[PDB]
Amino acid sequence: MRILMVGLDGAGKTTVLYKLKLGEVITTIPTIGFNVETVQYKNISFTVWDVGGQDRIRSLWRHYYRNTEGVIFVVDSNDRSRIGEAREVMQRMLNEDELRNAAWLVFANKQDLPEAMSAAEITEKLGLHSIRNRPWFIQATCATSGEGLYEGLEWLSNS
Amino acid sequence: MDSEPPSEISLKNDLEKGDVKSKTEALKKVIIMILNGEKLPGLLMTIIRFVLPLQDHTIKKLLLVFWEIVPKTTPDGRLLHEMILVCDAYR
Amino acid sequence: MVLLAAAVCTKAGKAIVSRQFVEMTRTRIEGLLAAFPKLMNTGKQHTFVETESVRYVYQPMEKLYMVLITTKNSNILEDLETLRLFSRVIPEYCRALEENEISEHCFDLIFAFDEIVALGYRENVNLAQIRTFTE
């Protein structure tokens, strides 16, 4: 299974990936580029493309769209200023023809932080209810603990 | 591929295949058809996707090659930006 | 630019692989190489021969011409010297000249062309230098 994981910078995309691959919480640098890794979960081998979220790189995601079976969209639940921006990025991503049938999994992340928005709140802000054309799911996660990560891999594998 | 102007559908297939040699050969086949002067933009997203960050020189060199002879014309996988897919991860 | 293109030709009537440093000679490259290199660049077994107001420097290898073309010139020694260095680099990639094997290593040759002559100004290359790039 081919997976594209994106989201704004600092959402926790690489932390998520290497928690999944190494069971370890690594010390990230901003990703100017991608990381690509293969992860085994329950007889599925997920090839995850973690593509950096800062602006220059954001402009490049479209090259990773093609062949994508599922999309992990990571959100920093503690950052309320950038939630609209996330909504804007994700909405036009939903309009992409190469992403047309891909399974849509939102991770509301850093759920560990006291003022993190809830997954329900995030669902309203991102406009997730309005997707009728394909599968979507939202999952509260904490990439450092590992909470919600495998519930994500589970949902994804049931595409 | 000496000069074969309709072969762009096969090149897309050959450009990502999970085999590095095939990808290199494909990108090479694109170069030779452009230099003669033949069809090339269909491929762009495929071309750009494997190679981008890597320090692995041969594909990078190949992509680097294709950016001095047609970068401006091709726009499927590049479009128009300041830090295009010609140079963003080529920093 | 002083050096329009650096080109490997087959006198099949086409430019087998060729390099346009900056977008100028695309299709133009093939027509020049195809007509002129067939006649031995219109030569008589002379390394410099000029035809249709374009300087062609060449070396025959089989049914193929390794060709340097200029239409301007800075020095005598220089034009030959880039061609010459090219001729050390080309059998490493293609085991002499031959259209099918030249065709297969479009990338190799083309990359060398950019490296050897940059924006028409004759830089220098060597077979070890070439390696770092195709690595």
UniProtKB/Swiss-Prot annotation, chain A:
Keywords: ER-Golgi transport, Golgi apparatus, GTP-binding, Hydrolase, Isopeptide bond, Lipoprotein, Myristate, Nucleotide-binding, Protein transport, Transport, Ubl conjugation
SMART domains documented for this protein: ARF, RAB, SAR
Residue sites binding GTP per the record: 8-15, 31, 53, 109-112, 143-144
Localisation: Golgi apparatus
Enzyme class: hydrolase
Cross-link for Glycyl lysine isopeptide (Lys-Gly) (interchain with G-Cter in ubiquitin), residue positions: 110
EC number: 3.6.5.2
InterPro entries on file: Arf1-5-like, P-loop_NTPase, Small_GTP-bd, Small_GTPase_ARF, Small_GTPase_ARF/SAR
Gene3D superfamilies per record: P-loop containing nucleotide triphosphate hydrolases (3.40.50.300)
SUPFAM superfamilies in UniProt: P-loop containing nucleoside triphosphate hydrolases
NCBIfam families: small_GTP
Subunit (UniProt): Interacts with RUD3. Interacts with VPS13 (via C-terminal part); the interaction is direct.
Miscellaneous comment in the UniProt entry for this protein: Present with 19300 molecules/cell in log phase SD medium.
Family: Belongs to the small GTPase superfamily. Arf family.
UniProt protein name: ADP-ribosylation factor 1
Classification lineage: Eukaryota, Fungi, Dikarya, Ascomycota, Saccharomycotina
From Swiss-Prot, chain B:
Localization (cell): Cytoplasm; Golgi apparatus membrane; Cytoplasmic vesicle, COPI-coated vesicle membrane; Cell membrane
Organ and tissue specificity: Predominantly expressed in the upper one-third of the oxyntic mucosa and in most regions of the pyloric mucosa. Ubiquitously expressed including platelet, liver, heart, spleen, lung and kidney.
Domain of life where this protein originates: Eukaryota
Disulphide-bridged cysteine pairs: none
Record's miscellaneous remark: Brefeldin A induces dissociation from the Golgi of the beta-COP and presumably the other coatomer subunits.
Quaternary context: Oligomeric complex that consists of at least the alpha, beta, beta', gamma, delta, epsilon and zeta subunits. Interacts with CAPN8. Interacts with SCYL1 and PRKCE. Interacts with COPG1. Interacts with ARF1 (myristoylated); this interaction is required for binding of COPB1 to Golgi membranes. Interacts (via trunk domain) with ARF1 (via switch I region); the interaction is direct. Interacts with KCNK2 (via N-terminus); this interaction increases the channel-mediated whole cell currents and promotes plasma membrane expression of KCNK2. Interacts with STX17. Interacts with TMEM115.
Function: The coatomer is a cytosolic protein complex that binds to dilysine motifs and reversibly associates with Golgi non-clathrin-coated vesicles, which further mediate biosynthetic protein transport from the ER, via the Golgi up to the trans Golgi network. Coatomer complex is required for budding from Golgi membranes, and is essential for the retrograde Golgi-to-ER transport of dilysine-tagged proteins.
Stated name of the protein: Coatomer subunit beta
Organism: Mus musculus (Mouse)
Organism placement in taxonomy: Eukaryota, Metazoa, Chordata, Craniata, Vertebrata
Gene label: Copb1
Residues of the full protein shown: 16 to 106 of 953
Swiss-Prot record, chain C:
Coiled-coil features, chain-numbered ranges: none
UniProt-annotated location(s): Cytoplasm; Golgi apparatus membrane; Cytoplasmic vesicle, COPI-coated vesicle membrane
Assembly description: Oligomeric complex that consists of at least the alpha, beta, beta', gamma, delta, epsilon and zeta subunits.
Family, as annotated: Belongs to the adaptor complexes medium subunit family. Delta-COP subfamily.
Function text: The coatomer is a cytosolic protein complex that binds to dilysine motifs and reversibly associates with Golgi non-clathrin-coated vesicles, which further mediate biosynthetic protein transport from the ER, via the Golgi up to the trans Golgi network. Coatomer complex is required for budding from Golgi membranes, and is essential for the retrograde Golgi-to-ER transport of dilysine-tagged proteins.
Protein name: Coatomer subunit delta
Taxonomic path: Eukaryota, Metazoa, Chordata, Craniata, Vertebrata
